[PDB]
Design a protein around this ligand. Structure first.
Ligand SMILES: *[C@@H]1O[C@H](CO)[C@@H](O[C@@H]2O[C@H](CO)[C@@H](O)[C@H](O)[C@H]2NC(C)=O)[C@H](O)[C@H]1NC(C)=O
Ligand SMILES: *[C@@H]1O[C@H](CO)[C@@H](O[C@@H]2O[C@H](CO)[C@@H](O)[C@H](O)[C@H]2NC(C)=O)[C@H](O)[C@H]1NC(C)=O
Ligand SMILES: *[C@@H]1O[C@H](CO)[C@@H](O)[C@H](O)[C@H]1NC(C)=O
Ligand SMILES: *[C@@H]1O[C@H](CO)[C@@H](O)[C@H](O)[C@H]1NC(C)=O
Ligand SMILES: *[C@@H]1O[C@H](CO)[C@@H](O)[C@H](O)[C@H]1NC(C)=O
Ligand SMILES: *[C@@H]1O[C@H](CO)[C@@H](O)[C@H](O)[C@H]1NC(C)=O
Lengths: 47, 108, 121, 49, 49
């Protein structure tokens, strides 16, 4: 039961933030994040 | 030069996070990289201070932030919670106790 | 920004006039005083027309402000991991340490630091 | 990436001085920057070694 | 990367530790200029293992 709908863009959830002056977050766990970049170096050698 | 063979901190250059490494691959008409960064996964909110107050002086971490909860104070880095003892080997002295905001009295 | 970050509800920028930089909520056009100044100065049937942007001036300002607000009070901590509660004065202390300048300058001259940025703006 | 969400030491890259911070603003057709740098104001000649 | 002393791991503050088979000394990655390990040259944390 699909349809096409136009919407206002949210551009992502708003990250509601505020801060105190006596406490800072400090990491207990981390990850090794590996991603892939695909990049053009050369064009077909048209002659 | 900066991610495969080194550790540049240019922001988001080889992906978001701190650069660790990068692995180039061949491709038709191009290059492929497997980019690797360090990104914090879980963090906790710790009471903190810029300095420890001792004999009227301010003892600053050489690097990092002081952890200041309960009955014990320590030194951690912004990128990792591994608390160290408050000694002259981990801290340095400058300024004073009337300068630092949040400075906490502790035996150094 | 991975997601648009909110400008904190409490404008604790250490006395800095970020209200001149970030969008003014009381206006019908959500632009900052710096932006109003520029926008008021920087400006068919013959077959040549101009298409609209996807991201409107306000939408660009929302992404821009998220990055900006993060930059001034939390840096990149709203990106690479969960947000860090660094109060503006400590963010500034770290900001000076990060360039080889002692943190004592922030605390000893907190008022002059606040005034020089604002004066320059 | 380098002056706004950062504080680059690229020399005089976003303006003369060491970058401390920077803030972007919207513009028709572009981006406006407020680039904040650290610049020595006073210095004195000390005997050194 | 570390030496074991009094049950703790001691790490070069900067550099790598080297042994000539008689002594352990800090050297740097960019240059072999040996320093006897003392608390001025090494940092202590965790445990040896
Ligand atoms: C952040 O700093 C402010 C400014 O000092 C602190 O506000 C003080 O709060 C105490 C506790 O109620 C009051 O007695 C003072 O009058 C306040 N000072 C001012 C100038 O208003 C605030 O406590 C700090 N926030 C945190 C979470 O520590
Ligand atoms: C930031 O700058 C604004 C100017 O846009 C300041 O607003 C002025 O405030 C003074 C006294 O505080 C008033 O006499 C003016 O009428 C205000 N001008 C306008 C246009 O409203 C504001 O005070 C500044 N904020 C800080 C923290 O310095
Ligand atoms: C620390 O507390 C703040 C409250 O403003 C919260 O938003 C934030 O998520 C907390 N940080 C962590 C890592 O839990
Ligand atoms: C810490 O020592 C300082 C000396 O500068 C003093 O002013 C302050 O009262 C002390 N704080 C506490 C909690 O004892
Ligand atoms: C030190 O003396 C030199 C030579 O006149 C001068 O160029 C420099 O500005 C002086 N530095 C100071 C006064 O800090
Ligand atoms: C190793 O160096 C130490 C001093 O660092 C010295 O006492 C010793 O003679 C050296 N051993 C050899 C085999 O050179």
């Amino acid at each position: 039961s699909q349809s096409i709908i136009a919407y206002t863009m949210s551009l992502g959830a708003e990250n509601s933030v505020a801060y105190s002056n006596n406490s800072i977050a400090i990491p207990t766990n981390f990850t090794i994040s590996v991603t892939t970049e695909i990049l053009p170096v050369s064009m077909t050698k048209t002659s | 030069s900066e991610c495969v063979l080194g550790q540049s901190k240019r922001v988001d250059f080889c992906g978001k996070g701190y650069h660790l490494m990068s692995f180039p691959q061949s491709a038709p008409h191009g290059v492929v990289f497997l980019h690797v960064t360090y990104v914090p996964a879980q963090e906790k909110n710790f009471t903190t201070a810029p300095a420890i107050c001792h004999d009227g002086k301010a003892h600053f971490p050489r690097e990092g932030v002081f952890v200041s909860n309960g009955t014990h104070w320590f030194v951690t880095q912004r990128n990792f919670y591994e608390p160290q003892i408050i000694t002259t080997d981990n801290t340095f002295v400058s300024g004073n106790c009337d300068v630092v905001i949040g400075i906490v009295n502790n035996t150094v | 920004v991975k997601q648009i970050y909110k400008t904190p509800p409490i404008k604790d920028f250490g006395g800095f006039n970020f209200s001149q930089i970030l969008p003014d909520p009381s206006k019908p056009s959500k632009r900052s005083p710096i932006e109003d100044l520029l926008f008021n100065k920087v400006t068919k049937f013959n077959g040549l027309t101009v298409l609209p942007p996807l991201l409107t001036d306000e939408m660009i300002a929302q992404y821009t402000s998220a990055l900006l607000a993060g930059t001034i009070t939390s840096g990149w901590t709203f990106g690479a991991g969960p947000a860090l509660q660094i109060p503006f004065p400590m963010q500034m202390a770290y900001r000076f340490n990060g360039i080889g300048v002692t943190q004592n300058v922030l605390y000893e001259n907190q008022k002059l630091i606040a005034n020089q940025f604002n004066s320059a703006i």
